[PDB]
Design goal:
The structure is cut from a larger assembly and holds 3 copies of chain A, 1 copy of chain B and 3 copies of chain C. By secondary structure, chain A is α+β, with helices and mostly antiparallel strands. Helices cover 43% and strands 11% of the residues of chain A. In chain C, strand 1 and strand 2 form a beta hairpin. The radius of gyration of chain C is 20 Å and the shape is elongated. The chains are: A alpha+beta, B mainly beta, C mainly beta. Strand 9 of chain A pairs parallel with strand 10 of chain E. Chain A: It is found in: Virion.
Chain lengths: 473, 108, 48, 49, 475, 48, 54
């Protein structure tokens, strides 16, 4: 009964329409992204939020672990591991290429690709990456990735939206998109605006284009940025801080008031020192106390002004907490505020933030990375740089998901103090509940090369003849 | 009990319209879309009689009365023939069509 | 013609009019030339 | 009893206008077609043209 | 009694609630309620926070299946049962989490994404609808497909009333069990006549064509209520209050000072504030320099307003209102409002415990059921396609032993730790005392005991081959 | 009005009057106003 | 006249007539402390300790 009319009317007028999220979003789709870009470019809080998002979802490094389903494919485990290590070696020598050749723009690496994609998905709702086959023979690989901002993809010539051609997205009857109408660069704003249509999928089974976002309900075609519930309060708070700073400025500026029937020049000379004997009225030499002798009929009223911060700190606390709730990030890391909080409280905050970040990582960055990894893998296979197992029951096209099964590791949870978590991990290993690859992943490493490096280290220590390390016999 | 929802479209062409403010000397309650000429004697703004040829100088934008010292009127654009009121003294349809020749005001 | 869509079955355009009267105009552009090469194949008879 | 904002009213107007224009152009295409295969002498004429 | 009669000295004499069913208490304004909840969650930061917490704790990040068929009931050998369970688990692993997004007809989500979306829309609408489509395109190995349906899509055809079997687009039997649905085609843009299609709840062959899950509160309920429906107006009024108070702070800070000068505005501004000095209305922009004490004559006074403390109890009032809102939403106020001050470890533990208990209850009562239905449909397709080997000596066939074959549960993201050392000691003590098992331990850790054992043995073999060190499980 | 169900087809009600001649009365209220969208869709002719 | 408890219902009181809201007085003007003292006295007289008595 609450949703009917409310107590004493109140919401006698609040009857928002009931329609699909696409119907409620697409007409103002451009405006929302425009305002989001404005905030992210000219707002400190937004820049902090996006930087924290990228640095926690991905961080400095983002590595691969290729775990094909050998059991399903009927392949020997040793052959599966050999293929996995060979493809990992090729992938690692390809991804960290200094020329940024993975990008046609040739200015960003793979981790930069992932971070930029997740950031633009954050402040736009979605990410677009296309794969291209160049004719350049300088490299063993001809597939490169190119980013597309959501602005570049829209209805060609701003044509009216239809049942299937929505915002430049051509969708079949069922509800799965198949074509995009991207637009070329908008700068400078005098060349003719051109459009190019691209199918999401090449006829041969290779993902020519990928568009990643998480929907909220059926029929959704475009993502919604995280600012859609916060942006108005964000800009209002910016205006508040601006006007409060102006008010503090003027209140501090105006301090004293002179009252006298005398001509202003002589009044300044006889009261505020002045130097008229030698525009901007007259400069005042800042010197000693200079007690004046104002005549009856004069006033030297010193304005006590007013306190600069009358509750603005508490207001920023409350509004930043609301913004943190809207953004899904903890207020502490959001506002660089960590006062009056205990160790347990800080750990709880970091825990929930890390859980949200791990979910977001898996559902955005992991999916994008897997898609681009299989896109590179198909080219590698067709290029024959790696040889498929002979006992392969199913073809690569059939077992594309099975062949390309892999997971990803980003920056680990650098916890509050280190010692307690590392000793609890060690005792987990002692008790046999966790496992080496699990904990080394949670730390950001891979047990395979960890073991290889430890073998190398102990071989070096044996050669130098100093001491066997903590791994021998 | 049967009402109709007319598509109120006073305009008649894609050409832009423009408005100018001039002193008001109208002698009667004149509704909007009223053609009006400049007074021969006092150079005042009076409603177009429909008898003088081409004397009409503009189209009334907002309805006013005698007490209105100034008024806003269209200076440019095209308007449909039917939806602009005409003075009764104007009879010939061709004259009505060609009344605003030589100006930025046209009718269709 | 700006973006090379000269030979098109349809061309829709929509622009807003500046100035004091605010408005935008909808327009679709086309130029049909429906033809038939061999008219003799068809025989038309007006009955009575 | 359940109204909508002027923005959505304008959206409705623009949609019906687009469909009407498409219907009109299809209509004139069919008129040309029936002239063509009805006489073989088809006069494309009109005011301001 | 006496309390419920009229009221203390009358009071609630006019409070006469219309005792009747929740069905007629919700259906008359159900569409408006759903629209209000959707708008509120779309435009409110706190509501988005609440649904995100739902999406990240009720389901969490992952989901691992554990198929425990009732081999006792089926009279089948345990080894055969577990071999079949391993086979079906491998098939499900290679099917559900493929990178294609082939299962969804929209081809943009995964299995975990579908579960998260379903639980979210069930939270903010009260119901969840999924459809199983056996598309004829046999290029993919599994020809089934899924597509969740929002409660807005399902509605009474032609927007009519409600009959004794057809209610809000749901056609039920005499006993109220749902028989079918009337799905309305998406009508974007909102002009076309949204056609209505009849979809049976189940296929004649026993296949669950349409799976609908909600939480009825009394007999005969067919459409659940969104959890927001408790405090929607309260949180809306909170939003209005915070916006109004922000505007109030804006205006309070806007006009810092006023001047009492009687002469012309321009001259007064020049002689009391300065500015001027233009090149060769917008009033007069004032350069910001230093001090610039003015001079005044009688009748002139520069009075700078002291304004007013912006936060006179607003923050604490908001804290109390968020207490109420979090109580309504069933989520901990601390977590929702992100204010963790003055909180001791023990009380934080207690609040987290109750919140997580609620979260796991919701998980088991929504996500577990939905995933079980989807897995049952997929298993039906798998068995009819003989992609897996049913036990040879099965007492009952799949069609009548669906539950017996479909005995399975799911493990999502576990209860993330709060201290680390404390719960690892918990686990160590439980395993060394025998009061718990590796299955429960790895489940609460978000792991699988079989996978853990396989990983441990393979790592032991690798370390033995490398001659590095035996792990803490040998011989 | 007090039951809040004022929108449906046929409303039944049986009630007893008080006093010695206590008698029951049965009632089926309705406000039926059926209609057709297009009158000109259906064509009527008076045969002769 | 019974008065419905609704929203703000701000009035438009004419000149001459006024509405005043009594600020009242604290319900406990040291009453709790006076109770502390007197119950202490009573507990001492009874021999039972104050904390359990009160």
């Amino acid at each position: 009964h609450g949703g009917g009319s409310g107590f004493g009317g109140q919401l006698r007028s609040w009857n928002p329409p009931s329609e699909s999220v696409d119907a409620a979003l697409l007409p103002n789709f451009t405006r929302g992204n425009a305002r989001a870009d404005d905030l992210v470019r000219n707002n400190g809080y937004a820049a902090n939020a996006i930087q924290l998002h990228q640095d926690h979802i991905v961080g400095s490094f983002f590595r691969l672990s290729h775990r094909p389903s050998w059991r399903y494919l009927g392949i020997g485990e040793e052959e599966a591991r050999a293929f996995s290590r060979e493809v990992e070696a090729a992938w690692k020598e390809f991804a960290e290429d200094d020329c940024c050749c993975i990008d046609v723009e040739r200015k960003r690496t793979f981790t930069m690709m992932i971070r930029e994609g997740v950031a633009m998905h954050a402040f736009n709702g979605e990410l677009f990456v296309q794969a291209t086959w160049d004719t350049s023979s300088s490299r063993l690989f001809r597939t490169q990735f190119r980013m597309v901002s959501p602005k570049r993809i829209s209805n060609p010539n701003n044509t009216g939206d239809s049942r299937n051609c929505r915002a430049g997205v051509q969708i079949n009857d069922s509800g799965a998109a198949l074509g995009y109408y991207v637009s070329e660069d908008g700068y400078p704003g005098w060349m003719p605006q051109k459009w190019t249509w691209i199918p999401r999928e090449l006829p041969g089974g290779r993902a020519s284009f990928i568009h990643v976002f998480e929907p909220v309900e059926d029929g959704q075609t475009r993502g919604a940025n995280v600012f859609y519930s916060v942006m108005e309060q964000m800009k209002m708070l910016d205006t508040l801080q601006n006007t409060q700073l102006q008010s503090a400025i003027v209140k501090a500026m105006y301090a004293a008031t002179i009252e006298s029937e005398l001509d202003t020049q002589s009044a300044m000379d006889f009261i505020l020192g002045a130097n008229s004997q030698e525009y901007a009225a007259a400069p005042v030499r800042l010197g000693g106390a200079k007690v004046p002798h104002l005549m009856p009929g004069d006033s030297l009223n010193l304005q006590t002004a007013q306190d600069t911060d009358n509750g603005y700190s508490v207001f920023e606390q409350s509004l930043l907490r609301y913004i943190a709730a809207g953004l899904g990030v903890s207020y502490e890391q959001l506002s660089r505020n960590y006062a009056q909080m205990s160790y347990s409280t800080a750990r709880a905050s970091a825990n929930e933030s890390w859980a949200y970040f791990m979910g977001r990582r898996k559902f955005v960055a992991s999916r994008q990375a897997s898609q681009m990894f299989l896109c590179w893998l198909e080219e590698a296979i067709v290029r024959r740089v790696v040889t498929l197992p002979s006992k392969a029951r199913f073809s690569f096209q059939e077992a594309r998901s099975a062949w390309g099964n892999c997971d990803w590791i980003g920056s680990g949870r650098m916890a509050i103090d280190g010692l307690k978590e590392v000793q609890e991990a060690v005792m987990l290993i002692e008790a046999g509940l966790s496992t080496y690859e699990k904990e080394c992943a949670k730390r950001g490493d891979d047990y395979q090369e960890i073991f290889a490096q430890q073998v190398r280290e102990t071989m070096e220590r044996r050669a130098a003849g100093l001491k066997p390390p903590a791994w021998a016999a | 009990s049967k009402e109709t929802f007319t598509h109120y479209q006073p305009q008649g062409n894609s050409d832009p319209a423009h408005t100018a403010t001039a002193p008001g000397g109208l002698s009667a309650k004149a509704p909007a879309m009223t053609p009006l000429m400049l007074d021969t004697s006092s150079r005042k703004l009076v409603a177009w009689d429909g008898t003088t040829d081409g004397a009409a100088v503009g189209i009334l934008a907002v309805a006013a009365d005698q007490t209105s010292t100034t008024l806003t009127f269209y200076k440019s654009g095209t308007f449909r023939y039917e939806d602009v009121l005409w003075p009764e003294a104007a009879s010939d349809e061709t004259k009505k069509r060609t009344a605003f020749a030589g100006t930025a005001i046209s009718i269709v | 013609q700006r973006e090379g869509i000269n030979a098109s079955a349809r061309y829709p355009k929509n622009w807003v009019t500046t100035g004091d009267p605010a408005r935008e105009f909808t327009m679709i552009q086309s130029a049909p030339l429906m033809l038939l090469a061999d008219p003799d194949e068809f025989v038309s008879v007006q009955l009575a | 009893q359940n109204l909508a904002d002027p923005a959505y009213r304008r959206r409705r107007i623009i949609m019906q206008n687009m469909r009407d224009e498409e219907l009109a152009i299809a209509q004139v295409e069919e008129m040309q077609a029936v002239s063509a295969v009805l006489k073989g002498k088809y006069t494309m004429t009109g005011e301001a043209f």
